[PDB]
Structure 1
Amino acid sequence: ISGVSPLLYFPPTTTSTTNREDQINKNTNIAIQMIKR
């Protein structure tokens, strides 16, 4: 890790607002999609 890095990497949490509803919803849409094909 030689070399002074330029940044203090923060946790990539930027869109913590990923409402479980819509997150799971898109998963279900993908799941139903793959099964039909």
Structure 2
Amino acid sequence: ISGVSPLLYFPPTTTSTTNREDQINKNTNIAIQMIKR
């Protein structure tokens, strides 16, 4: 890790609001699509 880095690592959390329901809904839709294929 030699060399002074320009920035301090911070969590990549930028989508502060990401409802669990939407994520599981998208997972379901992808799962359904793959199953149908």
Cα deviations by residue, 1:2-35 (Å, 9 ceiling, x for unpaired): 1000001111111131101110000000000000
C-alpha root-mean-square deviation of aligned residues, in Å? 0.7
Identity %: 100
User: How far apart are the structure 2 equivalents of 1:27 and 1:16?
Assistant: 19
- State the TM-score, normalized to the length of structure 2: 0.90
> Which portions of structure 1, spanning 4 or more consecutive aligned residues, are displaced by more than 3 angstroms?
none
Q: Structure 2: state its 5+ residue gaps.
A: none
Q: Structure 1: state its 5+ residue gaps.
A: none
How many residue pairs end up in the alignment?
37
